[PDB]
Design a protein around this ligand. Structure first.
Ligand SMILES: Cc1ncc(C[n+]2csc(CCOP(=O)(O)OP(=O)(O)O)c2C)c(N)n1
Ligand SMILES: Cc1ncc(C[n+]2csc(CCOP(=O)(O)OP(=O)(O)O)c2C)c(N)n1
Ligand SMILES: Cc1ncc(C[n+]2csc(CCOP(=O)(O)OP(=O)(O)O)c2C)c(N)n1
Lengths: 187, 555, 554, 555
């Protein structure tokens, strides 16, 4: 009953009603791939993170629902920026989940680390935020979803550090919220 | 005598000495295209702004000069962000010129406008700035170039609004500055130089480790003199490797990864002179596995924050690496004879040979071509006349094992960003720089990575750039598949297989020569033939996936 | 008929309905000063841009209207950043107009240039933008105003380069738009409203909790109608408190902090209707100490991110809080009679009285004036004719204890930023707004906090603004000193004593009336006298440091 | 042996050689206060974080060392932003340590949380970063210090979350690094130095212009040796002025503003050697009014972007200014015999004397005390034993005219930000540094400017810091009032008068000595008295408003 941060991500996505993700694999985000595999949630893996991002947009636009993109640290994220910008100007509800450098390995000049991904996304998202604790994952995923789906719709970036995703915690120590947000817009 | 902002850009680039740009057309930046047309300055136009950006990087890296990328507003810019980030972490001098919305049409919800491009580039550039007046173009282009070329080298973004570029002004109303910036970087204080040399002299087992800044300034003659005077073996990270190509075999330690086996051999260096090699991914972070905790470290870097970042050092010098190499050469040209280091150099040589022999002894192509054997086929052709560009993951890890014993003209591998796919654009740009040098560019990439920029076969054909693209095809995103199997479980492979597609067929459909090979004999034959012609080529090499490269085994 | 960019700014402000600006002069923004002079629009010029920014906040908060701050390039702007941040977390509609370096002189290492002001303000504004053309001024001023005034309210930065302002254009070539933005906020879907009212009707112990968005739209008539129809008691965070002032005593729950003691009394609410009150500092975060975990929560907020941020909710409605209050009043004017809630309302009252009496029983001024007693002296004078501004730390925590019983015209306390010192500028701006409201402003601040903006006594005197500044003087940065004693040790006090300086003497040297008091009688006399005259005053009140306010422990 | 994150911060500061901090308490940063208490490291606590930040700047500037500011989360940080911006433009080495919200309580709408402090500081710092783990504290504190102290100097923001500071770790599990960073700056390539000196030797009317980087490294012995050998007159911007104090009178050109009248005198310099003086506000931008367009310019700066920013230059060298001054001294030490510069030095002296005499002749104190006359009263007391800090606007423009003939131990004026009110905190921190120097600090400020930080009289009294605050009181925001009169009209004065308040009364109420004077005789008497006592003082000087300083017309 210990589960990874990546497992928390996927459990929260499932509870929100997400049934597909679009992405491209990296070790930084493997915990999400493994959780999706366990829960039979398809990840449509492309040949470029840009195509995955745009697919999440196309899914959102065609299906009038949330699109979810999933990319790894560093170039995974930077490859997704054209989708982010396109969704920004198009008012398209896409949750961009990106990996990032482990917090515990901060400022060690390591692989795929050192890009301020939140700063890069800030001008072109409704919200962009780096998760600081594994226990925050479900509430912050749901918060990000509410940001994306609310009027005017638009993209959100949730940056999930490798160690935050690999961390294991007692499943009974954190609640997975429902998506409690009225389907009826204000008039 | 009224000229456009775009003409001012191009006159300034020309005066700085720029001879090529890489880019992709848009109306927002057409004035720059038209000015290049007039001045006979080639713009190598690609199939993706990312490829254009990486091409400018490859040109800078292979050429040891400024790269220039040219992209349009909005998506032109956002498509260039991966190159910017890569250049940032790699300390590569590229001027990214981007269009943007017209100032006069600000906040009109119009085409390609509304992206705060400077804000997006700020965290990953030495300087990013949006031009506010056409009259400012020459001085700000030159300022941008000075920022990119100064130590440590890095990317700069100059954002040029559409109206600022289309606006016409009297050509005589503004001066086009020269590039007035010393070619010779700053050197250490003589007290610091003396201290460094005293430690180098006293050391039993000294090594030098070169980083990217050594490559950017390319002080080869000075390096040769210094190394000959002191007899100290020289290692490098990937980016410093080609700086070893003019050194005698005895003093070529090769890739810094080779230091791994030294401690168990009771041969750990007692002194390490780091010349722009940072503490980080390529140097073993702060683990002391390559740069021993027991060694005294002299570190020279143009960024003070790097000095002892992850490990205590004995002497921390802020200076240009090229300037420092010149200073070291000058000092050792007029001091006493240095201790003979033949035995130590021989130990370095022996340990490298032991590693290579060990890999050779373990590698078999009985059922499928082994990545190590495929790498050996390439190594036979590598010398000063060749730039090797490396992409993929397992692919470059294997390739690295053959690269220390050869002397490449250029070697361009992943840096800290580790961004799969950057190699195709990088190699295309490298091949442009290599033209004037008479060098041939070979990209060694993965089947996964090549997919990112595969349309660039079109560009190779349109521009008749004779790049050879070698695809090490293990029908997977390989290193990530290994991660799943090793770190998670044998039954936990998901999203990492790529058991489809004829890459040589794709190359051929773009008009490039395609080869498909699966053995030492077939691969050797294809590579020999591709190298014999000045034609772009794709060699699709079926290799085994299961072998684990030593660098992964260590991890 | 050629007019400056600054003249365009001011024509647009006037057309929007702006009647006052707060600021500090610079050459970079002189065209705006000159235009205001021509048009008889007062600019209240302070001794620090921070005080000016906070004055614009106080004017906005006390007046339920747009505040406008006006600052020059460089340090003018950087001096305004604490106001921007405070307004950001407080959801306060302030238009910050800042000068900046001329576009034509970009990158010349010149005076006041080279600060990326928009980048600095971006994380703490609804919108931040630098104007690129004089002709854009009116449309971008109006755009910025719409951004600031829309739900949830907040600060906007409009950066106006010197050349953009000085440039002259034919007045006939640019239209000055009207502010065309509905005064009515969006309301919930009737299905959502129906569900909320169905839950409210079935609840045994329902409460309402108001937040800042309720104060911004000030839908007092509707709130009264809704509350009278349903009989449901109403609580508020500090910012929503003055919205309870027009309600009957039986439905005034007062500050939301009063919910603390309910669970132990077996009286925890079973339903909470949150109207712009966020989960956070003032509502007990996700602790359930005020908003019970066992309660069903209906939350209404203009920002979807806030809905159930820290706690699970039953119904999450994105709407304007004012629009929602109007909708609720309209619905309850037409539905059946509502269940009697007299007993629950009396329980609410008794629990509030039990808290107040307990503090009263414990508080003694035997050897020094007790902060609770000093607070009671102030409370005697609080009604619709008064705005209370609260700063300091222990000072406002003690003051909060007397605030639920009284019905202030305005109450402006620290929000999430908790930035000591913002009170002085805030209260100066509030007093300007209060002029047309016929209200008197009283700042209640700490001896530490008053030091931040103490030069503003000069401004009170120059502008003849009758602000009364009451300094609760415990010769220390008090709450921080308590932290050291309680969390570290009694011998670990360091950097927190302030055993120097005559604050009333400082005020007098700036020409304000100064008083120094040390007892209930002396303090009562000074406050009565200060209130009897329309003159700025400083009342330096010697109070005990040792007592621990209930909220400090909690 | 379990210790807090705050304890790690303080152990690291101590190891780097930090002896004082400036700040204002909050619980978020109490662990740092408690550690300082244990280690007897003074924290000078002010009445405003802005004053604390400026005090760290003043300490750094007057002391030629690192300044350290310490502020709590939220408003602690936002209140420090003007100091950060001022230090940024002034190239002042200050480490700003800020608290921030606990990482474990992220996104809970809690007290003092939710401000992106690093994003706010990013445009105005050399580096800004939020610490993610307690064990990273020593290495990141030292990294931040190296960033701040390296050329060109500047501010750094290190953001320290409350939980990261409160967390306890085993002291033996984290090493506290030394500050291993050479004190010696990088120097030019000798080819560049040879060319620079050959040009300097050849010039008929050479001048040197010092900028702030010369003050930061304070290579006074080398500067003296170089100037003695070459006989070349030396000018400085405000920040470089005190570096001229040890030079022979013949080669003191004083403030660079004095070059204004040279071209009219047919004596424009033919060569200018700029040492860290940038093209910008203090050097006449690109106007050529001070640095002639006809002169050959040799510019040395650690930032390549600055080289020829606004004007074409002959030789652009990237190096540390201190290291360069050392290199110049070494190269000219055994050089002999440089050209006689007697007549040229005499011309520089004569032009300065002409300016001063002309101003004297146009200044009357018939009714109100003239700002020039008030400035002369101060000048009588300025020498190596004094630091002068200047604030206000007309106030410093007038003061500047007396500053070239005297030899201040320190001179700290507005730089590019020109932010009224920064002088009080600055002077307070300078006075702290000056205790060790044995100097008396005198702030010369305006009536408008003093109001920004007037509560700091409390701090001077609590801390027994004998700063003398001289208020030049013209009952107005003066330069801005002149702007209204001059640029708009006599009837268009609005928002600029300040005809209220007794500043000496305010100082007295905080326990400082208050003086109010209105004449040459009353002021000189008061200043003599203030200097005789080791007590903080406020001297409120009634001066005329109408006089226009020369620099106001030039500017
Ligand atoms: C832009 C980007 N996306 C994803 C990753 C994660 N990643 C690391 S190695 C790897 C596999 C690369 O496969 P390939 O190019 O075929 O080389 P191989 O390892 O199979 O030799 C991937 C996807 C990355 N580093 N960069
Ligand atoms: C701008 C700012 N600086 C510092 C703090 C830390 N702080 C919290 S409470 C407090 C004490 C305030 O003292 P005072 O204003 O005299 O009020 P008291 O608690 O004594 O009543 C301080 C300095 C803060 N919250 N904001
Ligand atoms: C922070 C800041 N606010 C406003 C200005 C605009 N300004 C320039 S000069 C000046 C007047 C300063 O008056 P004072 O300090 O009394 O000096 P004086 O010119 O009268 O000698 C002002 C307000 C500024 N430069 N910086």
């Amino acid at each position: 009953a210990m589960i990874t941060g990546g497992e928390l991500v996927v459990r929260t996505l499932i509870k929100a009603g997400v049934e597909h993700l679009f992405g491209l694999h990296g070790a930084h985000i493997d915990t999400i791939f493994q959780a999706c595999l366990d829960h039979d949630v398809p990840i449509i893996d492309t040949r470029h993170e840009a195509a995955a991002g745009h697919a999440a947009e196309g899914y959102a636009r065609a299906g009038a629902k949330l699109g979810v993109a999933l990319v790894t640290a560093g170039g995974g994220f930077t490859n997704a920026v054209t989708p982010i910008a396109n969704a920004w100007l198009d008012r398209t509800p896409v949750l961009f989940l990106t990996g990032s450098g482990a917090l515990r390995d901060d400022e060690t000049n390591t692989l795929q680390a050192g890009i301020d991904q939140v700063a890069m996304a800030a001008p072109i998202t409704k919200w962009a935020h780096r998760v600081m604790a594994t226990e925050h994952i479900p509430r912050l995923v749901m918060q990000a979803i509410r940001a994306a789906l609310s009027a005017p719709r638009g993209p959100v970036l949730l940056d999930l550090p490798w160690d935050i995703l690999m961390n294991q915690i007692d499943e009974d120590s954190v609640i997975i919220p429902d998506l409690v947000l009225s389907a009826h817009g204000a008039r | 005598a009224m000229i456009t902002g775009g003409e001012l850009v191009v006159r300034t680039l020309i005066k700085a000495g720029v001879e090529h740009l890489f880019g992709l057309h848009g109306a927002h930046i057409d004035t720059i295209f038209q000015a290049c047309l007039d001045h006979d300055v080639p713009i190598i136009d690609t199939r993706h702004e990312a490829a254009a950006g990486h091409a400018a990087e490859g040109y800078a890296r292979a050429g040891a000069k400024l790269g220039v990328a040219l992209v349009t507003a909005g998506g032109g810019f956002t498509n260039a962000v991966t190159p910017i980030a890569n250049a940032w972490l790699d300390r590569t001098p590229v001027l990214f010129l981007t269009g943007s919305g017209a100032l006069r049409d600000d906040e009109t919800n119009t085409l390609q406008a509304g992206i705060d491009q400077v804000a997006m580039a700020a965290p990953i550039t030495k300087w990013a700035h949006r031009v506010m007046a056409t009259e400012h173009i020459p001085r700000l282009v030159m300022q941008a170039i000075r920022a990119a070329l100064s130590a440590p080298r890095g990317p700069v973004l100059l954002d040029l609004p559409w109206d600022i570029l289309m606006n016409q002004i009297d050509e005589d109303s503004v001066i086009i500055p020269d590039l007035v910036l010393s070619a010779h970087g700053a050197r250490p204080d003589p007290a610091d130089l003396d201290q460094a040399l005293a430690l180098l002299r006293k050391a039993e087992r000294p090594v030098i480790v070169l980083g990217s800044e050594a490559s950017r300034t390319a002080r080869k003659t000075a390096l040769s003199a210094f190394v000959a005077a002191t007899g100290v073996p020289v290692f490098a990270d990937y980016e410093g490797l080609s700086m070893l190509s003019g050194l005698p075999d005895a003093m070529r330690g090769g890739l810094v990864q080779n230091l791994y086996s030294f401690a168990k051999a009771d041969a750990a260096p007692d002194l390490v002179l780091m010349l722009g090699a940072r503490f980080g991914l390529n140097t073993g972070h702060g683990s002391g596995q390559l740069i021993p905790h027991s060694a005294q470290v002299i570190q020279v870097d143009p960024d003070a924050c790097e000095l002892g970042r992850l490990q205590g050092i004995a002497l921390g010098i802020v200076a240009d690496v090229g300037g420092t190499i010149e200073a070291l050469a000058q000092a050792t040209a007029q001091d006493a004879a240095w201790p003979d280091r033949g035995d130590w150099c021989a130990k370095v040589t022996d340990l490298a040979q032991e590693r290579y022999a060990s890999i050779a002894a373990k590698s078999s192509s009985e059922h499928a071509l082994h990545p190590f054997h495929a790498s050996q086929v390439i190594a036979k052709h590598v010398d000063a006349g060749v730039t090797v560009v490396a992409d993929g993951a397992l692919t470059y890890l294997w390739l690295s094992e053959v690269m220390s014993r050869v002397k490449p003209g250029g070697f361009l591998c992943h840096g800290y960003l580790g961004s799969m796919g950057v190699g195709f654009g990088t190699a295309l740009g490298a091949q442009v720089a290599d033209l004037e040098a008479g060098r041939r560019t070979i990209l060694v990439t993965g089947d996964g990575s090549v997919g990112y920029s595969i349309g660039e076969f079109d560009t190779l054909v349109r521009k008749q750039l004779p790049l050879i693209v070698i695809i090490m095809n293990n029908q997977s995103w390989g290193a990530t598949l290994h991660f799943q199997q090793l770190a998670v479980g044998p039954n936990r492979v998901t999203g990492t297989r790529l058991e489809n597609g004829s890459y040589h067929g794709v190359a051929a459909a773009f008009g490039a020569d395609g080869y498909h090979v699966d053995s030492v004999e077939s691969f050797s034959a294809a590579l020999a033939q591709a190298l014999a012609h000045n034609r772009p080529a794709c060699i699709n090499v079926a290799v085994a996936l299961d072998p684990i490269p030593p660098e992964e085994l260590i991890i």
